[PDB]
Scaffold this active site. Structure first.
Site, PDB file in Angstrom:
ATOM      1  N   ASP A 108       1.187  -1.595  -0.072  1.00  0.00           N
ATOM      2  CA  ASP A 108       0.146  -0.081   0.239  1.00  0.00           C
ATOM      3  C   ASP A 108       0.848   1.231  -0.105  1.00  0.00           C
ATOM      4  O   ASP A 108       1.990   0.930   0.682  1.00  0.00           O
ATOM      5  CB  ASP A 108      -1.031   0.648   1.619  1.00  0.00           C
ATOM      6  CG  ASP A 108      -1.933  -0.822   1.020  1.00  0.00           C
ATOM      7  OD1 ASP A 108      -1.284  -2.209   0.857  1.00  0.00           O
ATOM      8  OD2 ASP A 108      -2.946  -1.302   1.637  1.00  0.00           O
ATOM      9  N   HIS A 148      -1.076   4.205  -0.121  1.00  0.00           N
ATOM     10  CA  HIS A 148      -1.914   5.742  -0.344  1.00  0.00           C
ATOM     11  C   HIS A 148      -1.958   6.959  -0.207  1.00  0.00           C
ATOM     12  O   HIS A 148      -1.294   7.688   0.847  1.00  0.00           O
ATOM     13  CB  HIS A 148      -2.295   5.054   1.094  1.00  0.00           C
ATOM     14  CG  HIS A 148      -3.352   3.972   2.323  1.00  0.00           C
ATOM     15  ND1 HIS A 148      -4.503   4.229   1.076  1.00  0.00           N
ATOM     16  CD2 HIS A 148      -3.339   2.845   2.197  1.00  0.00           C
ATOM     17  CE1 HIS A 148      -5.166   3.077   1.275  1.00  0.00           C
ATOM     18  NE2 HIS A 148      -4.626   1.753   2.082  1.00  0.00           N
ATOM     19  N   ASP A 153      -4.240  -0.267  -3.238  1.00  0.00           N
ATOM     20  CA  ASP A 153      -3.918   0.692  -1.910  1.00  0.00           C
ATOM     21  C   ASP A 153      -2.832   1.908  -2.514  1.00  0.00           C
ATOM     22  O   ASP A 153      -2.726   2.323  -1.940  1.00  0.00           O
ATOM     23  CB  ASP A 153      -4.091   0.520  -1.137  1.00  0.00           C
ATOM     24  CG  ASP A 153      -5.677  -0.324  -0.109  1.00  0.00           C
ATOM     25  OD1 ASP A 153      -6.214  -0.770  -0.961  1.00  0.00           O
ATOM     26  OD2 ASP A 153      -5.411  -0.380   0.582  1.00  0.00           O
ATOM     27  N   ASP A 180      -5.647   7.575  -1.182  1.00  0.00           N
ATOM     28  CA  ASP A 180      -6.933   6.807  -0.074  1.00  0.00           C
ATOM     29  C   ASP A 180      -6.017   7.165   0.608  1.00  0.00           C
ATOM     30  O   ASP A 180      -5.036   7.172   0.856  1.00  0.00           O
ATOM     31  CB  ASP A 180      -8.114   6.491  -0.135  1.00  0.00           C
ATOM     32  CG  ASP A 180      -8.836   6.509  -0.828  1.00  0.00           C
ATOM     33  OD1 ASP A 180     -10.065   7.776  -0.978  1.00  0.00           O
ATOM     34  OD2 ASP A 180     -10.619   6.136  -1.028  1.00  0.00           O
ATOM     35  N   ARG A 181      -6.397   7.806   2.088  1.00  0.00           N
ATOM     36  CA  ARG A 181      -5.976   8.135   3.464  1.00  0.00           C
ATOM     37  C   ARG A 181      -4.901   9.536   3.284  1.00  0.00           C
ATOM     38  O   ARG A 181      -5.344  10.444   3.110  1.00  0.00           O
ATOM     39  CB  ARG A 181      -5.434   7.025   3.911  1.00  0.00           C
ATOM     40  CG  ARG A 181      -6.334   6.418   4.049  1.00  0.00           C
ATOM     41  CD  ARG A 181      -7.335   5.623   5.416  1.00  0.00           C
ATOM     42  NE  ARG A 181      -7.612   5.176   5.344  1.00  0.00           N
ATOM     43  CZ  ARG A 181      -8.520   4.318   6.441  1.00  0.00           C
ATOM     44  NH1 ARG A 181      -8.886   5.539   7.881  1.00  0.00           N
ATOM     45  NH2 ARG A 181      -9.333   3.519   6.760  1.00  0.00           N
ATOM     46  N   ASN A 197      -9.151  -2.422  -2.431  1.00  0.00           N
ATOM     47  CA  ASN A 197     -10.101  -2.338  -2.217  1.00  0.00           C
ATOM     48  C   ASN A 197     -10.322  -1.124  -2.277  1.00  0.00           C
ATOM     49  O   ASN A 197     -11.401  -0.448  -2.054  1.00  0.00           O
ATOM     50  CB  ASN A 197     -10.022  -3.109  -0.356  1.00  0.00           C
ATOM     51  CG  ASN A 197      -9.220  -2.405   0.773  1.00  0.00           C
ATOM     52  OD1 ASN A 197      -8.521  -2.918   0.137  1.00  0.00           O
ATOM     53  ND2 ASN A 197      -9.760  -2.298   2.017  1.00  0.00           N
ATOM     54  N   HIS A 198      -8.652  -0.142  -1.568  1.00  0.00           N
ATOM     55  CA  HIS A 198      -9.545   1.061  -2.100  1.00  0.00           C
ATOM     56  C   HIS A 198      -9.586   1.467  -3.862  1.00  0.00           C
ATOM     57  O   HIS A 198      -9.098   2.938  -3.720  1.00  0.00           O
ATOM     58  CB  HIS A 198      -7.763   2.417  -1.295  1.00  0.00           C
ATOM     59  CG  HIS A 198      -8.433   2.564  -0.236  1.00  0.00           C
ATOM     60  ND1 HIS A 198      -9.410   3.575   0.752  1.00  0.00           N
ATOM     61  CD2 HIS A 198      -8.391   1.528   1.381  1.00  0.00           C
ATOM     62  CE1 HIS A 198      -9.622   3.930   1.767  1.00  0.00           C
ATOM     63  NE2 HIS A 198      -8.929   1.867   2.081  1.00  0.00           N
ATOM     64  N   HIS A 224      -3.570  -8.179  -3.091  1.00  0.00           N
ATOM     65  CA  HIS A 224      -3.875  -7.224  -2.256  1.00  0.00           C
ATOM     66  C   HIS A 224      -4.508  -8.007  -1.275  1.00  0.00           C
ATOM     67  O   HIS A 224      -3.724  -7.957  -0.048  1.00  0.00           O
ATOM     68  CB  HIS A 224      -5.406  -5.475  -2.487  1.00  0.00           C
ATOM     69  CG  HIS A 224      -4.889  -4.691  -1.814  1.00  0.00           C
ATOM     70  ND1 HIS A 224      -3.815  -4.159  -1.054  1.00  0.00           N
ATOM     71  CD2 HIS A 224      -5.878  -4.912  -0.616  1.00  0.00           C
ATOM     72  CE1 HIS A 224      -3.888  -3.504  -0.802  1.00  0.00           C
ATOM     73  NE2 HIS A 224      -5.364  -3.576   0.219  1.00  0.00           N
ATOM     74  N   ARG A 238     -12.960  -6.326   9.780  1.00  0.00           N
ATOM     75  CA  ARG A 238     -13.789  -5.134   8.304  1.00  0.00           C
ATOM     76  C   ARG A 238     -14.606  -5.491   8.051  1.00  0.00           C
ATOM     77  O   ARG A 238     -15.435  -4.528   7.193  1.00  0.00           O
ATOM     78  CB  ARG A 238     -13.167  -5.232   7.441  1.00  0.00           C
ATOM     79  CG  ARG A 238     -10.775  -5.509   7.589  1.00  0.00           C
ATOM     80  CD  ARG A 238     -10.162  -5.300   6.735  1.00  0.00           C
ATOM     81  NE  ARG A 238      -9.107  -5.748   7.019  1.00  0.00           N
ATOM     82  CZ  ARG A 238      -7.728  -5.053   6.589  1.00  0.00           C
ATOM     83  NH1 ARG A 238      -8.436  -3.878   6.044  1.00  0.00           N
ATOM     84  NH2 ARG A 238      -6.530  -4.940   7.117  1.00  0.00           N
ATOM     85  N   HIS A 291      -2.959  -4.706   2.299  1.00  0.00           N
ATOM     86  CA  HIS A 291      -3.575  -4.533   2.892  1.00  0.00           C
ATOM     87  C   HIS A 291      -3.821  -4.358   4.700  1.00  0.00           C
ATOM     88  O   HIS A 291      -4.129  -3.123   5.273  1.00  0.00           O
ATOM     89  CB  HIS A 291      -4.459  -6.279   2.864  1.00  0.00           C
ATOM     90  CG  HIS A 291      -5.682  -5.998   2.873  1.00  0.00           C
ATOM     91  ND1 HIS A 291      -6.666  -4.624   2.892  1.00  0.00           N
ATOM     92  CD2 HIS A 291      -6.685  -6.524   3.178  1.00  0.00           C
ATOM     93  CE1 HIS A 291      -8.124  -4.397   2.730  1.00  0.00           C
ATOM     94  NE2 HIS A 291      -8.061  -6.301   3.274  1.00  0.00           N
TER      95      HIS A 291
HETATM   96 MG   LIG Z   1      -6.377  -1.810   1.982  1.00  0.00          MG
HETATM   97 MG   LIG Z   2      -5.230  -0.954   2.713  1.00  0.00          MG
END
Ligand SMILES: [Mg+2]
Ligand SMILES: [Mg+2]
EC number: 3.1.3.16
Length: 467
Positions: A211, A213, A240, A243-244, A272-273, A321, A369, A396
């Site tokens: 990731d 991000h 990923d 995001d964030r 997933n993002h 991922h 989650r 992840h």
């Molecule tokens: Mg993730």
């Molecule tokens: Mg993640």
């Protein structure tokens, strides 16, 4: 005192919590909850720590317990909403914010929370291909734009080296160039199969990252420490990208740049993002809308839908991922056959590839989650040995060291976002594989200074308690 021992633990859990040691907060909340399983605050406090560790399922479960124990515990509704909001389940969030407004506030709850959540439910409710409503040469570049441009409609190294310097100085790439990258990268991706297969011959290497991000200045650090990508120094980025972090546009465009430039030596796997559901919540949609338009974003959404789900090197080491599956007897052939071009289902092999997590104990449990599963060593072994594979690599999950090795080395996790959200204090890592030796060498790296921008500065105000 059993009850007083529990309160002793709780106090200790709050201490860990306020200094971002959420793993211990969770443990010392669970110890307190064991001694006293009947106090709503214990469930509220832990729900928040689960929320901040992206455990939305357990977060939802604890908040529910808190509300049932105490109908008047307002933080219970806040945190249950935050949990449903974290999965983008905004109708169910509304109904909790609603429940707080009629315990009579003219508060930050009343006109701020409930109203703004209602707007998001409403904006959601409004909702051919978007490649259509686009015109290349119709878009035009200004006298006063001193930025990177494509050389005769194509990406070049000069372009990519200019792009990163541009972005390092917090400057925007011109949109015609942005659209040009996305139109082409969708073309390259939609040709590929759900399962990508590379050969790494005798003497070849490859760098697998986890990731990122939107921590652009750490993406450079990687490239400054491990060198820029090429057909002699290939990379895999394992979902990923966005995001964030508040430089997600900077990240995704540079990753899309190199992918067009090196279609056989730069690989992107869907995380997933890379999904409307998450992008609308955790900053990416806002960032794209702020810097470009909603149309640019809908293009981003379309291109992500064509991102491959997994990668299999040499028929030995598989990459995704999330992880492995809710059902036994899933093979590589099954993965190849997945119709990927869409949003992931609520449950399934597509969902699992993006979402699942490893767990120490054997078998399966519903994920923490609130989506997919947790899978044990026996599930990993059964899968790996059914495909004569050595071991998988996934990301992840955040790791304090930047990586982790588990299931007796059969399941490896790598995470490339140091000082995650400018707060977790974690180190990050990338992996060197090789053809002669299909085995991981973990390099770790620390975070690097960036401009004064809070993570999630483009996200909605309502998931800020869950940071
Ligand atoms: Mg993730
Ligand atoms: Mg993640």
């Amino acid at each position: 005192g059993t009850l007083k021992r529990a309160e002793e633990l709780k106090t200790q859990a709050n201490d860990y919590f306020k200094a971002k040691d959420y793993e211990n907060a969770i443990k010392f909340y669970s110890q307190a909850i064991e001694l006293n399983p009947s106090n709503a605050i214990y469930y509220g406090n832990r729900s928040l720590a689960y929320l901040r560790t992206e455990c939305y399922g357990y977060a939802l479960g604890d908040a529910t317990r808190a509300i049932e124990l105490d109908k008047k515990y307002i933080k219970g509704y806040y945190r249950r909403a935050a949990s449903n909001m974290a999965l983008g389940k905004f109708r169910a969030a509304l109904r909790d914010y609603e429940t707080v407004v009629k315990v009579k506030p003219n508060d930050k709850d009343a006109k701020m929370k409930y109203q703004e959540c209602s707007k998001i439910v409403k904006q959601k409710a409004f909702e051919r291909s978007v490649v259509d409503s686009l015109d290349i040469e119709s878009m035009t570049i200004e006298d006063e734009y001193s930025g990177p441009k494509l050389e005769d409609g194509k990406v070049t190294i000069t372009f990519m080296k200019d792009l990163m310097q541009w972005y390092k100085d917090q400057k925007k790439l011109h949109r015609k160039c942005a659209y040009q990258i996305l139109v082409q990268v969708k073309e390259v991706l939609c040709k590929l199969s759900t399962l990508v297969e590379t050969t790494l011959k005798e003497t070849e290497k490859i760098t697998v990252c986890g990731d990122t991000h939107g921590q652009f200045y750490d993406l450079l650090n990687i490239f400054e420490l491990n060198g820029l990508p090429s057909e002699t120094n290939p990379y895999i980025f394992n979902g990923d990208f966005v995001d964030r972090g508040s430089f997600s546009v900077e990240v995704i465009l540079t990753l899309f740049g190199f992918k067009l430039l090196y279609p056989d030596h730069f690989h992107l796997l869907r995380g997933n993002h890379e999904t409307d559901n998450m992008n609308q919540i955790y900053g990416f949609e806002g960032e794209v809308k702020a810097k470009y338009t909603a149309q640019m974003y809908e293009l981003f959404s379309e291109v992500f839908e064509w991102l491959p789900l997994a990668q299999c090197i040499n028929g030995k080491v598989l990459i995704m991922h999330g992880g492995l599956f809710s059902e036994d007897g899933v093979t590589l052939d099954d993965i190849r056959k997945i119709e990927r071009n869409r949003q992931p289902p609520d449950s399934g092999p597509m969902c699992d590839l993006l979402w699942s997590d490893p767990q120490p104990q054997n078998g399966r449990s519903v994920s923490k989650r609130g989506v997919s599963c947790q899978f044990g060593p026996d599930v990993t072994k059964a899968f790996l040995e059914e495909n004569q594979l050595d071991y998988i690599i996934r990301s992840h999950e955040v790791k304090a060291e930047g990586y982790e090795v588990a299931h007796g080395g059969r399941c490896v996790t790598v995470f490339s976002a140091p000082n995650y959200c400018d707060q977790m204090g974690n180190k990050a890592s990338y992996i060197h594989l090789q053809g002669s030796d299909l085995r991981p060498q973990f390099h770790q790296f620390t975070a690097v200074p960036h401009p004064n921008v809070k993570p999630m500065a483009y996200a909605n105000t309502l998931l800020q308690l869950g940071m």
